[PDB]
Structures are given as C-alpha cells and as structure tokens.
Amino acid sequence: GSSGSSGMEAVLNELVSVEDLKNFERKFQSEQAAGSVSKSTQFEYAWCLVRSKYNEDIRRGIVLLEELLPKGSKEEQRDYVFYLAVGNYRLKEYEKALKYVRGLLQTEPQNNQAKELERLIDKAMKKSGPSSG
C-alpha cells in the first residue's frame, strides 16, 4: 500500500521487464557492435537477465555475472554474488546460491538481503529439493 519495496522478498518477487531488458539488451548489443561490451553493461544486462521472469535469462545472466566476478575489483563482487545467488536460487541452485550467499555474507554480514536469502533458500530446500538419492 503506497510504495512497497519490502527488502528482499520484494527484490526476488519483482522481476525485470522486457521494456527494460530491451533497454539493456540494446546497450549490450550496440556496445558489442560498437567495439566491445563494457563490463558496465555486462553486469547490467546480466542483472537484468537474472531479474527477468525467464530462466534462460538467469542462465545467460549468471555467466556474465560470473564473468565479472573475477573481472571485478572488490565491492564489485559484492553486488555480483548477491545476484549470482538470486539467479542461482531461481534455478533451485541452492548449493551454489548459498555458496555465493555465504561467501558474500563473509564480506557482507550486515547485508540483510544476504541474510534473508540465506533463509529463503534454506526454506526452499525444505519446500522442494533434489536430494541425494
């Protein structure tokens, strides 16, 4: 009611919009034919992808995200992992999500979003998981 923006349950809930994705997908593409896509747009579109309601995006989103991970400085990886997990989680990739939400928490303990997620994925597993065997 009147402006939402809960915290995390809203971030995950809300997904990217074609209108936007297109806006980014355009920069990414253009930038490409421009001479070379800049990490900037890279993380953008990527984050835009993962955000997308489609899984495919998450797939073609993580890669980039995982591409900027090592191609990141420091705090840059903080904004990355955070997503890698978001996108990973979407693929019920808790194992990874956490692995990312964990290492991200190590550097970002105060980060609530990370905290929540940790629990979110935690519940996810219980809700529905692959299980071993």
Helices (DSSP H) in 52-128: which residue ranges? Answer: 55-68, 75-90, 94-107, 112-127
Distance, CA of 46 to CA of 95 (rounded, Å):
21
Approach to solving = NMR
Please say whether the beta carbons of 111 and 104 come within 8 A: yes
d(CA 51, CA 48): 5
Find tokens 């940790």 and name the residue: 118
The CA-CA-CA angle for residues 61, 70, 125, to 5°, reads: 50
Give dist(CA 20, CA 49) in Å, integer.
10
Residue type, 72: G
| 19 class by beta-carbon count within 10 Å (0-12 exposed, 13-18 middle, 19+ buried) | exposed
- CATH code for the structural domain at 1-133: 1.25.40.10
